Amino acid sequence: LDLQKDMVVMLLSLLEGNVVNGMIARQMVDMLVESSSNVEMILKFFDMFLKLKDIVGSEAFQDYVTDPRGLISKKDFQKAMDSQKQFTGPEIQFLLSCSEADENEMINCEEFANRFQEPARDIGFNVAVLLTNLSEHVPHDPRLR
Amino acid sequence: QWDRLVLNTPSFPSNYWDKFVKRKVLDKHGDIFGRERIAELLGMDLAS
């Protein structure tokens, strides 16, 4: 993720001094469209983990949590996410795979939510800055939308 | 604080035109905050 942040800083340095509808900005948008699927995967990673941090604090998720220890079983986690309806089936399966459940199939919800918040904050902010810069310097481009 | 009294009353939107505000709120906030708890807050009967 730090390497990603460095690459995005390089892209922003390329965008430095760019006029609206600039050639380098248009080339960057073309590169993003060429790598659309991977860009979408990265954005989905960030979105899923931010939404997880939001959901784990939710009252419905806390209700689905019942273990006095504070952990939640894999089945309870799946049912809570299904009820939230804010994730898809494959996304819930990926979250379960990353949950790092113990031999008893119990997930530490707090640790799972907080694992990726700090490591991915810098790259997330840099990606947001890159997208905002490109959007404002290339206003009329449907692909960036 | 006073408005808490009217939330679960059956005739909440008596003068207001939107008679489906309760269901709109349930649909909007039913997933994060819990459908059963929203129904309890708004005096709603899901089977009805």
From Swiss-Prot, chain A:
Domain EF-hand, residue spans: 59-87
Top-level taxon of the source organism: Eukaryota
SS bonds (residue pairs): none
Post-translational modification summary for this protein: Channel activity is modulated by phosphorylation. Activated by reversible S-nitrosylation. Repeated very high-level exercise increases S-nitrosylation.
Localization annotation: Sarcoplasmic reticulum membrane
Known role: Cytosolic calcium-activated calcium channel that mediates the release of Ca(2+) from the sarcoplasmic reticulum into the cytosol and thereby plays a key role in triggering muscle contraction following depolarization of T-tubules. Repeated very high-level exercise increases the open probability of the channel and leads to Ca(2+) leaking into the cytoplasm. Can also mediate the release of Ca(2+) from intracellular stores in neurons, and may thereby promote prolonged Ca(2+) signaling in the brain. Required for normal embryonic development of muscle fibers and skeletal muscle.
Domain notes from UniProt: The calcium release channel activity resides in the C-terminal region while the remaining part of the protein constitutes the 'foot' structure spanning the junctional gap between the sarcoplasmic reticulum (SR) and the T-tubule. Pore opening is mediated via the cytoplasmic calcium-binding domains that mediate a small rotation of the channel-forming transmembrane regions that then leads to channel opening.
Name this polypeptide is given: Ryanodine receptor 1
Organism of derivation: Mus musculus
Full-sequence range covered: 4020 to 4164 of 5035
